[PDB]
């Protein structure tokens, strides 16, 4: 089948969503340094190196350890942690539950993934009263109580750490994890963050092909607006603020590449190229066999807004060494 | 473009998800009675009558009314409600917030449960990291006498807490925020076939219907969803599971919203694929309204996709010709 149909004008003017946060795509994010991504990322051979299906599944892990730290009574912090490779009930990969985010855990100034869930053991002594609570989710070493972010999956850990004090009944040392699929971003301090996850925070499995720059052609991510985690509320009115989240593909591209054979239409070293026409100016975007998108931004790391986009037109197959026009 | 690519073997062997619950598609659900659907439903002309984008958005409504009933001893039930038409920050439609489910509020029927909050800046309850379960749906009679509604004209959308608290919420008007994931409440988890039943689906004015046409009956896509219960939120699915249905694979909805299909099918035509099983095959068809059809007649038995071998396109054909059903 032809790759041409994988980008259309609606994908970039309101109907698209990034494959990491599921947020409406409103901008392109050049990455001149390059990056890698495998989770919920598909290539043109119909395969993924990640642990997630091309949907935003809820997170369920049957067995990790639970550790608790608290000096008083209302600040007891819960840390659930499992070795990678223990998500045995995930047909895609036992690296981590389907839907677990591919981001480093926050250790002791970057953005972290927050979701709402629970740590549960049938033998425990807590009663359910209809609530779930916010956790920081990520990959790590040193859990519990010496957490350091990790960005690889062999011999590392996945962590869920409660943001607020939890309630009494936390007896058991092992427990299951359940987290609703929606992710919001925790950031703090007076420092600014451009977007989350930064390339040095993205978790990949071994063999994951990287997206390295090729001349002035650099990989690009898709940016949307995501809620910030804060202490005013969970998310109503987005009053805790917003930031930009990024993903490697529009989820519509991920899904179609998992559903349909595109393996003949692209060789290594080739882009499928589209033209993005703006009011004044246009740029070309390319897709390579590994499922990564590219832009001709050279060193420019700044966001490209899609708010004035007129249309997307297919161009065709081009060598990846040919400069993608970048005339904005 | 041709509709042939909109169904492939992976869609029905693990990678498909229904457009209502986002559950992995494991079965086909014949609907002899027929049904309608508009929310997160797209047609081959690239348009929807619903209020939702082809994604599973979190739910956000800037102003409804909150009321409270309860003695005081962890008994206070919170009911939030707004008229349809007040979701004015939804560019798709002001009927209801993007992501609000198209199901009647519960008054052996399954209902939609999500985890969320009712928030007013002046409320006295401080935030400590939790959201709670609400039953969500369209209704009339809120707040005191909630009853399921199936249209958007003159009706309400409601969120009603399942568990009681004490005091802390007092402001009469407040915003609703609910996380996108829906689980299913049902007091008869043995007698609930699938959720929603055709008579529970909420549709907007103009929404085309899917009625039977000969032995051809409309079909829904079914997947396993978590039941809401009082053991926990969802860890291990220990509260049980149910069948949820949607009118389309989300991959189909999505592609119909992104790509022009408006010249590839006339009214009265199906695009037809063949589904091959061990010891039989059947045909599935898709009409220009975006509904799928099967030739199962008055049979409402669920067709399991466990033993599916492959999907192969067949081509355009009139909707009066019988979709073969040799299983």
């Amino acid at each position: 089948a032809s790759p041409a149909g994988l980008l259309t004008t609606p994908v970039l003017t309101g109907a698209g969503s990034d494959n990491r946060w599921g947020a409406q795509i409103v901008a392109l994010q050049p990455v001149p340094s390059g990056f890698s991504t495998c989770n919920r990322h598909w290539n043109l051979n119909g395969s993924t190196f990640g642990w997630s299906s091309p949907r935003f599944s809820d997170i369920d892990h049957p067995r990790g350890n639970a550790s608790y730290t608290g000096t008083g009574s209302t600040n007891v912090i819960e840390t659930w942690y499992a070795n990678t490779g223990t998500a045995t009930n995930n047909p895609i990969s036992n690296i981590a539950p389907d839907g677990f985010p591919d981001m480093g855990a926050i250790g002791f100034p970057t953005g972290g993934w927050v979701g709402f869930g629970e740590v549960w053991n049938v033998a425990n002594g807590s009663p359910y009263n209809g609530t779930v609570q916010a956790y920081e989710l990520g990959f790590a070493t040193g859990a519990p109580n010496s957490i350091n972010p990790a960005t690889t999956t062999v011999g590392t850990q996945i962590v869920a750490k409660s943001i607020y004090g939890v309630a009494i009944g936390q007896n058991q040392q092992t427990a299951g994890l359940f987290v609703l699929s929606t992710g919001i971003v925790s950031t703090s301090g007076p420092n600014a963050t451009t977007y989350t996850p930064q390339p040095n925070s993205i978790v990949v499995a071994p063999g994951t092909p990287a997206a390295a720059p090729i001349g002035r052609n650099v990989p690009v991510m898709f940016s949307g607006v995501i809620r910030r985690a804060g202490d005013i509320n969970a998310g109503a009115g987005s009053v805790n603020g917003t930031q930009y989240g990024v993903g490697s593909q529009p989820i519509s591209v991920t899904l179609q590449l998992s559903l349909t054979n595109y393996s003949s239409s692209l060789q290594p070293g080739q882009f499928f190229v589209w033209q993005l026409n703006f009011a004044s100016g246009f740029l070309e975007i390319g897709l390579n066999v590994d499922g990564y998108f590219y832009i001709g931004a050279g060193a420019s790391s700044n966001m490209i807004e899609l708010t004035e986009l007129i249309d997307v037109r297919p161009v065709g197959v081009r060598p990846n060494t040919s400069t993608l026009v970048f005339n904005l | 473009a041709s509709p042939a690519g909109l169904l492939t073997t992976p869609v029905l062997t693990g990678a498909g998800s229904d457009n209502r619950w986002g559950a992995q598609i494991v079965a086909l659900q014949p609907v002899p009675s027929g049904f309608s659907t508009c929310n997160r439903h797209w047609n081959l002309n690239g348009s929807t009558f619903g209020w939702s984008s082809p994604r599973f958005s979190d739910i956000d409504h800037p102003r409804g009314n909150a009321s409270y009933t309860g003695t005081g001893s962890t008994n206070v039930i919170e009911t939030w409600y707004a008229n349809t038409g007040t979701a004015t920050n939804n560019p798709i439609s002001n009927i209801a917030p993007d992501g609000f489910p198209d199901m009647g509020a519960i008054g052996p029927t399954g209902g939609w449960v999500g985890f969320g909050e009712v928030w007013n800046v002046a409320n006295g309850s401080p935030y400590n990291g939790t959201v709670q379960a609400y039953e969500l749906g369209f209704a009339t009679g809120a707040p005191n006498s909630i009853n399921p509604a199936t249209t958007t004209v003159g009706t309400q959308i409601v969120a009603k807490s399942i568990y009681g608290v004490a005091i802390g919420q007092n402001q009469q008007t407040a915003g609703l925020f609910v996380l996108s994931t829906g689980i299913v409440s049902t007091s008869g988890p043995n007698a609930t076939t699938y959720t929603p039943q055709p008579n529970s689906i909420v549709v907007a004015p103009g929404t085309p219907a899917a009625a039977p046409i000969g032995r051809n009956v409309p079909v829904m896509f079914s997947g396993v969803i978590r039941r809401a219960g009082d053991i926990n939120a969802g860890a291990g699915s220990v509260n049980g599971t149910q069948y949820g249905v949607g009118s389309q694979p989300i991959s189909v909805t999505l592609q119909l919203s992104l790509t022009n299909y408006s010249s590839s099918l006339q009214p009265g035509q199906f695009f037809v694929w063949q589904l091959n099983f061990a010891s039989g095959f059947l045909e599935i068809g898709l009409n220009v309204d975006g509904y799928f059809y099967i030739g199962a007649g008055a049979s409402s038995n669920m067709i399991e996709l466990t033993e599916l071998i492959d999907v192969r396109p067949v081509g355009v054909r009139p909707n009066t010709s019988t979709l073969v059903f040799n299983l």
Epitope: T9, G14, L309, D311 | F49, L258
Partner: nanobody, 107 residues
Framework: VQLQESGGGLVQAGGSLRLSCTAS????????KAWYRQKERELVAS???????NYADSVKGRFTISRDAAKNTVYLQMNSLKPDDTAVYYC?????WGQGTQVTVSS
Amino acid sequence: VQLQESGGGLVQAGGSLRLSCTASRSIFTYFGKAWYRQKERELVASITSGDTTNYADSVKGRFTISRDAAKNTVYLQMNSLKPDDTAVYYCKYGSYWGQGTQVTVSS
């Protein structure tokens, strides 16, 4: 879903018409809304979900395309008309085409 256009007729050069286009139901589409005229049909003017307007070169500066999503309606303000503008003008409402409204400009 059907379309209903209006505002077409015969006018001397320099005059002005207004074209209207109203879809029969309250639908939403991500496809852009546009006006086309007809040699072979050219794009007169277009507008996308993000409300950004794209004009043909021959009509630039004179025509203005506007939308009222609440009324399911797109407009074409035709000013400083010229005999080159005479054609059948078609509304494109996402993928829905309308039966053109005839526009003539005499010198």
